[PDB]
Symmetry: none
Subunit: 75 residues, 2 copies
Amino acid sequence: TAIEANSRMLKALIEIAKAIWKALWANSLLLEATSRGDTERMRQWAEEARKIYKEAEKIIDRADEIVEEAKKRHD
Amino acid sequence: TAIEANSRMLKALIEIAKAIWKALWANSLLLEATSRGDTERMRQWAEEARKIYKEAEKIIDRADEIVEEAKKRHD
């Protein structure tokens, strides 16, 4: 019964993984920006990351919500 | 009864991913601070990023603690 919420929390975890993926891409763009020594793409990934952090917060909320959705149906 | 194993290992997985996200966002803030316009950030990361890290560290350890326990329940 909670396995539905397992699949769904898995998707949510994949969304968390997407967030992490974009964070890594942000690290890449930062390695790009510091290599070229600029500060544009820095603010690019910065803003993108802030957005994604907000969305990551929400996604994790819904994730843990789905965890609670899986958890309540106990034993 | 399988949903049990699923949910357990999945919550574990999620928290460990969240640990990755803890250390990640820690280094991320540090990367925002890695612009090198301030060095007092030493105290910031050395404590706050250290806390969630050691939090992130043992969560993984105790997350694994139940990984071993689940599998061997059929002994």
